Amino acid sequence: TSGVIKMAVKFDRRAYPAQITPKMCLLEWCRREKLAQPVYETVQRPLDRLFSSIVTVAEQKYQSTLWDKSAALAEQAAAIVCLRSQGLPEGRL
Ligand SMILES: [Cl-]
Ligand SMILES: [Cl-]
């Protein structure tokens, strides 16, 4: 159950309904299957002030390799890696 699963992704807000995001889809999958809910860890780097995040779900870790303009945006990209690497739907129009 070790290691980190990764992809190069960014969250594109106009590709989803304003009120249904990847973080919320991931939370609903955890409720349905009675798993512990997700834990995020987010950091900002001094080189260029961008953010990156890692999410832990069911003892497995997931991360995007790109950096983005806010904590919220980084956290949404982490959620996408978790869902898309597993073939789960993520809310796209
Ligand atoms: Cl959450
Ligand atoms: Cl934002």
Residue numbers in the entry: 349 to 441
Please, what does the article write about this entry?
However, this belief has recently been challenged by the discovery of a dsRBD serving as a major tRNA binding module for human dihydrouridine synthase 2 (hDus2), a flavoenzyme that catalyzes synthesis of dihydrouridine within the complex elbow structure of tRNA. Dus2 is found in all eukaryotes and catalyzes formation of dihydrouridine 20 in tRNA. However, in stark contrast, we showed that, despite the presence of a HD domain, hDus2 and by inference from the sequences probably all animal ones instead use a novel extended dsRBD version flanked by a peculiar N-terminal extension (NTE) and C-terminal extension (CTE) to provide the major binding sites for tRNA substrate. By solving the crystal structure of this dsRBD in complex with a dsRNA together with extensive characterizations of its interaction with tRNA using mutagenesis, NMR and SAXS, we establish that while hDus2 dsRBD retains a conventional dsRNA recognition capability, the presence of an N-terminal extension appended to the canonical domain provides additional residues for binding tRNA in a structure-specific mode of action.
Mutation of the conserved residue, K371, reduced the binding by ∼8-fold while that of K419 or K420 by >4-fold respectively, demonstrating the importance of interactions engaging both α1 and α2 helices. In order to substantiate the idea of a synergistic effect due to NTE, we tested the effect of a double mutation in the canonical dsRBD. We chose to produce K419A–K420A because of the important role played by these residues (see above). The double mutant led to a ∼17-fold decrease in the apparent affinity for tRNA, rather hitting for an additive mode of action of these residues. Similarly to R361A–R362A, this effect is purely attributed to loss of positive charges since the structure of K419A–K420A is similar to that of the wild type (RMSD of 0.6 Å over 82 Cα).
